């Protein structure tokens, strides 16, 4: 097995494949997690409690770093407690807004390196997020079925 491989379908769907697992990656102005109620990830080990299998946290670990995320320095990403029935959802706050402006610049830079042709939907002064759902979880809906995922020709 190599490292995780990536694919971009259109501007609304990016996907990472890590071993036998696939993840839906989206960027939009919609958030469903909050510091107050969900899990704050301060270190990579914390990712274990965001996914059905603590050991596929690896692909998200690799991806966060590939993206430019600095564990010690940057705002912790949030994630839905593995136990909830929703379930998986890792959320990066990349808003072009004051508190997260420079960090967002960076992550989007990462996205440009990872997905050639990445389209930046984030608007000045507005809120914006990067969201990852593991394919198969309810939170991935049908976004990883044949008419989407199988249409994406993977590389990397």
């Amino acid at each position: 097995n190599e490292l995780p491989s990536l694919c971009m379908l259109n501007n609304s769907f990016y996907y990472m494949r890590g071993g036998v697992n696939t993840f839906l990656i989206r960027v939009s102005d919609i958030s469903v997690l909050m510091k107050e109620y969900d899990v704050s990830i301060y270190e990579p080990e914390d990712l274990g409690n965001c996914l059905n299998k603590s050991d596929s946290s690896w692909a998200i670990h690799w991806f966060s770093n590939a993206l430019g995320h600095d564990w010690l320095m940057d705002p912790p990403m949030l994630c839905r407690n593995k136990t909830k029935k929703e379930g998986s959802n890792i959320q990066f706050n990349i808003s072009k807004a004051d508190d997260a402006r420079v960090y967002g610049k960076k992550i989007r830079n990462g996205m440009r390196h990872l997905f050639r042709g990445f389209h930046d939907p984030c608007e000045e002064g507005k809120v914006c997020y990067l969201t990852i759902n593991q394919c198969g979880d309810p939170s991935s809906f049908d976004y990883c079925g044949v008419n989407h995922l199988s249409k994406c020709q993977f590389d990397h």
Partner: protein, 633 residues
């Protein structure tokens, strides 16, 4: 036959050594813990209650079985989803642990609009049109059924309900909760015929929109995607917002399904020694969505202890109730007093000739600060005398502290099992409780446990004890005195108050060519009828059970004669012109008339003339029904 003083002492001393908390704890054990109506655990408790009644050796114990359609949630999850109008990609916010029985099973997508408590006023005060939008409202103030109706009335396409932290200071923001949105009581799907085949519902009171309960966390996540600060007037969390951003709207999916269940009403009876065919009925809700310690346990515990005590007083201590006492353990209370209503419906127009009073025991213990009561005015005197010699569990003072308590009494609402008795059956009813100015936050949640209860109320045993004493004194007075402790004179104040209000339009009644003279005459005639009845009681020989029977039967019919005879109980079950629901109630007549100051087309002059007529006729009829012999006029 014993003296009232001895019965008072006996009841009190039996109460002194009664262990309430043990029973409440016992009902919170795993054998009963989650007891949704019709479930095996509900059925377990039903069997346990029934056994206990048999051990108490009541005159007869029996089952009142019913098959009813309730709604439960499907194997498919209900979901609350945020949609990006740009590209229409969705984000799952929650799959609620709870649900709202009787919600339309449907999927709807629109803008989300906050409407506070969803009260009729809250909607009018909105600067954002609800039409075609999903609405979100806080729990409280009014029933879910009303919130849905008010919203549906403005063409909202769905309803979310959460518990804000200001009204519900619950630490766990992920807590999910339950309720129903049927705007009535009983089974809404009651085809008068058996069917495979499917008939529409008609005047069911059922929602045509999806409604769903969400955790405070899910609501705040929704607020995260909304704009506009909430009016400080609402006194709500700073979290709250009013409307979704331009680019976003919410999608709600409810997939609840209809399930037919077997509910059991468990009954015990201590037969009366003089008129056993007349009864006081004491009931409590046995079912709950979660553990329902306060919702269900307290009431059922009091029901059990009261049953035991009275059985002992009859068999050991010589208590001899004139009339029968029936103890009722209801099921499917959580769905709108369904158990209670189904039984009531077997005796639509005949029950008021047997049951002269219903005492509800539900949620009698929720706090410590206050003692609240809602009831027919026919019981205000009984209630007052009872508060005058029952002591506050904490305070030590008599419950009676305000000479004017009766004018501040709020009326029974739809979520109270006491409601259908009074408003549908015409049987005087009373509910009461120890509580705060605050709703018990854990009702309808999985946190309604004994441990939670015993924690907010460490004096639980003493407080439950005071709750039993009021119910017990009610029951003794009612079956001991030779007269019925129904104060029929109270409805003079009620009629006076109503006409007094109506007379604030003696001008508008001119501009319509109408006289109120026949209505004044009805009120006068009722006054005369009560005066004559009091005189008759005074002149009667209290030891002549024939004359008392005759006078008592007249008193027993007062309440029922305020049920409007001009409306079908199927179309509008709550016929009580004082306490029911619809265009036939005195309040409706006033509201239609208040809509005449605005030159808007809301006023309905024709309707009013009919309302005026029907009211007059109803009131006259009641006065005539009370006057006695046809040659006395």
């Amino acid at each position: 036959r014993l003296y009232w003083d001895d019965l008072k002492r006996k009841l009190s001393e039996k109460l002194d050594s009664t262990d309430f908390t043990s029973t409440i704890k016992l009902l919170n054990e795993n054998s009963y813990v989650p007891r949704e109506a019709g479930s095996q655990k509900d059925e377990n408790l039903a069997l346990y209650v029934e056994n206990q009644f048999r051990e108490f050796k009541l005159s007869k114990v029996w089952r009142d079985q019913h098959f009813v359609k309730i709604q439960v949630k499907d194997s498919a999850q209900n979901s609350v989803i945020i949609v990006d109008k740009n590209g229409r990609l969705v984000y799952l916010v929650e799959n609620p642990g709870g649900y709202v029985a009787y919600s339309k099973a449907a999927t709807v997508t629109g803008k989300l609009v906050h409407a506070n408590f969803g009260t009729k006023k809250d909607f009018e005060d909105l600067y954002t049109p609800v039409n075609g939008s999903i609405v979100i409202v806080r729990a409280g103030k009014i029933t879910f059924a009303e919130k849905v109706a008010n919203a549906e009335s403005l063409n909202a396409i769905g309803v979310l309900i959460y518990m804000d932290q200001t009204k519900f200071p619950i630490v766990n923001a992920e807590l999910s909760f339950f309720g129903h949105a049927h705007l009535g009581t009983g089974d809404p799907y009651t085809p008068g015929f058996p069917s495979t085949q499917f008939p529409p519902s008609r005047s069911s009171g059922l929602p045509n929109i999806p409604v769903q309960t969400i955790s405070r966390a899910a609501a705040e996540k929704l607020f995260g995607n909304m704009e506009g600060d909430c009016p400080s007037d609402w006194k709500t969390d700073s979290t709250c917002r009013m409307v979704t951003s331009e680019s976003k709207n919410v999608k709600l999916t409810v997939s609840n399904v209809l399930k037919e269940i077997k509910i059991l009403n468990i009954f015990g009876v201590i037969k009366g020694f003089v008129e056993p065919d007349h009864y006081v009925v004491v009931g409590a809700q046995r079912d709950a969505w979660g553990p329902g310690a306060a919702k269900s346990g307290v009431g059922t515990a009091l029901l059990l202890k009261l049953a035991q005590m009275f059985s002992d007083m009859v068999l050991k201590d010589g208590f001899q109730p004139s009339r029968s006492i029936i103890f009722a353990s209801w099921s499917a209370g959580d769905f709108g007093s369904v158990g209670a209503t189904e039984w009531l419906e077997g005796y639509l127009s005949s029950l008021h000739l047997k049951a002269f009073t219903y005492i509800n025991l539900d949620k009698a213990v929720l706090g410590t600060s206050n003692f609240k009561v809602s009831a027919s005015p026919l019981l205000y005197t009984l209630i007052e005398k009872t508060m005058q010699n029952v002591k506050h569990p904490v305070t030590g003072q008599f419950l009676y502290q305000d000479s004017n308590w009766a004018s501040k009494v709020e009326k029974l609402t739809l979520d109270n099992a006491a409601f259908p008795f009074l408003a549908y059956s015409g049987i005087p009813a009373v509910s009461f409780c120890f509580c705060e100015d605050t709703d018990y936050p854990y009702l309808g949640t999985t946190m309604d446990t004994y441990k939670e209860l015993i924690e907010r109320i460490p004096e639980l045993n003493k407080v439950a004890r005071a709750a039993a004493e009021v119910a017990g004194q009610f029951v003794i007075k009612l079956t001991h005195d030779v007269e019925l402790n129904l104060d029929y004179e109270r409805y003079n104040s009620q009629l006076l108050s109503f006409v007094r209000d109506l007379n604030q339009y003696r001008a508008d009644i001119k501009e319509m060519g109408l006289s109120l003279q026949w209505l004044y005459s009805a009120r006068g005639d009722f006054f005369r009828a009560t005066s004559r009845l009091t005189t008759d009681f005074g002149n009667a020989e209290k030891t002549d059970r024939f004359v008392m029977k005759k006078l008592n039967d007249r008193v027993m019919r007062v309440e029922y004669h305020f049920l409007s005879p001009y409306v079908s109980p199927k179309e509008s079950p709550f016929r009580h012109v004082f306490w029911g629901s619809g265009s036939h109630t005195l309040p409706a007549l006033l509201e239609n008339l208040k809509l005449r100051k605005q030159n808007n087309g809301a006023f309905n002059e024709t309707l009013f003339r009919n309302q005026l007529a029907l009211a007059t006729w109803t009131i006259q009829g009641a006065a005539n029904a009370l006057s006695g012999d046809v040659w006395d006029i």
